[PDB]
Paper text:
Diterpene synthase VenA is responsible for assembling venezuelaene A with a unique 5-5-6-7 tetracyclic skeleton from geranylgeranyl pyrophosphate. VenA also demonstrates substrate promiscuity by accepting geranyl pyrophosphate and farnesyl pyrophosphate as alternative substrates. A promiscuous DTS VenA containing an atypical 115DSFVSD120 motif was characterized to catalyze the unique cyclization of geranylgeranyl pyrophosphate (GGPP, C20), giving rise to 1. The monomer of VenA holds a typical isoprenoid synthase α-fold comprised of twelve core α-helices and four additional short α-helices.
To provide structural basis for the substrate promiscuity and unique cyclization mode of VenA, we first sought to crystallize VenA in its substrate-free form. However, we did not obtain any crystals of the wild-type VenA (VenAWT) and supposed that the N-terminal flexible loop region (1-15 aa) might prevent the protein crystallization. Thus, the truncated form VenAΔ1-15 with the N-terminal fifteen amino acids removed was expressed and purified. Of note, the in vitro enzymatic assays indicated this modification did not affect the activity of VenA (we use “VenA” to stand for “VenAΔ1-15” unless otherwise specified). In the crystal structure, VenA is dimeric, which is consistent with the result of size exclusion chromatographic analysis, indicating that VenA forms a homodimer in solution as well. Helices B2, C, G1, G2, H, J, and α4 form the active site cavity, and helices A, B1, and C-terminal loop contribute to the dimer interface with a buried area of 2350.5 Å2. Similar to dimeric CotB2 and SVS-A2, the two monomers are organized in an antiparallel arrangement and each active site points away from the dimer interface. The PPi-Mg2+-bound and apo forms of VenA show slightly different conformations with a Cα root-mean-square deviation (RMSD) value of 0.327 Å. The obvious movements were found in C and H helices, which resulted from the binding of metal ions and PPi group by the catalytic motifs, including the atypical Asp-rich motif (115DSFVSD120) located on C-helix and NSE motif (256NDLLSWRKE264) on H-helix. The side chain of Tyr108 forms hydrogen bonds with the guanidine group of Arg344 in the apo form, but is rotated to the opposite direction in the holo form.
Author numbering:
A (entry chain B): 31 to 193, 201 to 267, 271 to 373
B (entry chain A): 31 to 375
Write the structure that this text describes.
């Protein structure tokens, strides 16, 4: 096996800012995870393992421009989806199997839209979902709440089902599963805009295609240690195309740059076009800029990817152990 | 011995603010610790144990009003002082007889005194101290630089007295404990660094004793809160210089009685700090922008130090993650601790 690969400097063209309250939001998010989601963990050990991933600072890194309340709401949302994704591992815990998922999660979310706790199916996470719905729905248009309903249903269905021929079919499945519709809706929420109409008309089809593909590729690169040990572009290149790891990494880093520059081109085309003068469109596009820059800053930071025990030292390029329990970028092999 | 104690709600009357770049300053401060101090630790794994304590967020929690560069300088200083404190506090690293202790300690003293010298340092502590001195002394008046020299000397005198208290197996009476800890806690450092962060020079006012009451009560508040939040980690260790040990072993109090007494004392000194501060603010210097900036700086030092001490795994155990709770039952025996609303049955 390789045991060690080199991650070169990535373009990092887009703003990566921290919310002015990022450190405090991470702690208050951690507090909310204990209060609302403790029962999803089989012990204090498992909860703290999760809290050590610092998932609570993702929100403030993606929406550094947002009002503190909305930044807290998004930080708690992302911890919530990560807990349910990673730690709610039983059809009993989630409230449905793959068979029952559709009509079950339709009724859970129907109940949440009404201000309830999503009923017996949602027993270990419905108080959590209710608290987030209360906070977030209040600052959303009714169209946005329709979209949140569909987004949360798909997410829980996606979870129930979880219990390639080529690279592009990998990209298609990574895009369908990354939660892009959530990210897009929450970007609108943070920026206090409603892009519901412009988005159905396809104004953002190109910026979303490149934006989300950049997010996914950066994520596949920085999550490769975690995934190697457990559906990802790195695995497709190595196994389906038979590339050496370093060649796969080099290919994916160049692909990050392709989609990053193409995102900027496509964003600039909307800014130059007949909706580009609109302030809400500008605010949304700045939102996506900070989501893309901030997600990558977050992905360097998290012990979810560098191993429980790791503490980021700010290094972003160099040699990294594929296998070691705890990793960091070293300036030599 | 008791297995737990109850920490009642403390007054928490003073502002605990985070620097707007706090998260980022912590990471960069972790980077400085690896670049300058990696070789102070026995391994990568002991370096990570130290980095997991989040000592890098102390700076941004105590000078949230400062410019980012000065906040970074203070963040790095506090991490460095925490390393020095853990080395001199460690009988194995230092020596557990006078002779061996004194030789090791003399090397630490000589290394840190290289900080403000003209020739390059050879030691790990010397190069770290030189780096921090060059960054900080650049933002200081000549009088503040002399005071920085005196602050290091005060800190080292205090460390020497804490070391001797272990060697001689002697718990000080409360007033001798507080008198040592004003040195060992680095109060002169914190005062000067608070002027530096606020970009003021209080050298003249301090010489005239404008802040004697403000300092007396504010520093006592800081030391007492630190003693309460550090007890979990200090309780099994021996002859350490903490008022919890003074009240238990010198004055014969049961742990919970000692804790309750020290919480009453935190509130005494915290209210006396606010009264003393308000007197300066109402007095013939109280309109001065620099005086007001300094006292606002001490408010944030006092509030932020307490916030930091609740969050750090240095106190709540490696692997702990603060949930924001500030009062309740705390285990002395658990490998990780947090405040609970019931005792262990
Ligand atoms: Na902050
Ligand atoms: Na996980
Ligand atoms: Na690192």
């Amino acid at each position: 096996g390789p045991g060690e690969f080199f991650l070169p400097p990535l373009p990092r063209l887009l703003p990566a800012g921290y919310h002015p309250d990022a450190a405090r939001i991470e702690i208050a998010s951690n507090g909310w995870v204990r209060r609302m989601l403790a029962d999803c963990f089989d012990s204090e050990e498992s909860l703290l393992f999760f809290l050590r991933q610092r998932n609570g600072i993702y929100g403030p890194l993606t929406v550094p421009y947002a009002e503190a309340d909305r930044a807290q709401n998004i930080a708690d949302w992302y911890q919530f989806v990560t807990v349910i994704d990673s730690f709610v591992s039983d059809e009993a815990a989630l409230g449905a199997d793959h068979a029952a998922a559709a009509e079950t999660f339709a009724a859970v979310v129907a109940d949440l839209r009404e201000g309830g706790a999503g009923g017996p199916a949602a027993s270990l996470y419905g108080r959590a979902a209710q608290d987030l719905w209360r906070r977030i729905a209040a600052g959303m248009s009714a169209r946005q709440v329709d979209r949140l309903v569909a987004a949360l249903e798909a997410f829980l269905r996606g979870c129930a089902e979880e219990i390639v021929p080529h690279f592009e079919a990998c990209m298609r499945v990574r895009v369908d599963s990354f939660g892009c519709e959530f990210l897009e809706l929450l970007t609108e929420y943070a920026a206090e805009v409603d892009m519901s109409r412009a988005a159905t008309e396809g104004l953002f089809d190109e910026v979303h295609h490149h934006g989300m593909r950049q997010l996914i590729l950066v994520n596949d690169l920085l999550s490769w240690r975690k995934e190697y040990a457990q559906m990802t572009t790195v695995r497709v290149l190595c196994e389906v195309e038979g590339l050496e790891l370093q060649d796969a990494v080099d290919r994916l880093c160049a692909l990050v740059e392709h989609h990053e520059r193409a995102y900027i081109t496509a964003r600039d085309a909307v800014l130059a076009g007949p909706h580009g003068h609109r302030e809400d469109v500008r605010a949304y596009l700045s939102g996506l800029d900070h989501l893309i820059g901030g997600s990558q800053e977050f992905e360097y930071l998290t012990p979810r990817y560098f191993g429980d025990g790791s503490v980021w030292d700010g290094s972003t390029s160099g040699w990294i152990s594929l296998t070691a329990s705890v990793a960091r970028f070293r300036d030599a092999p």
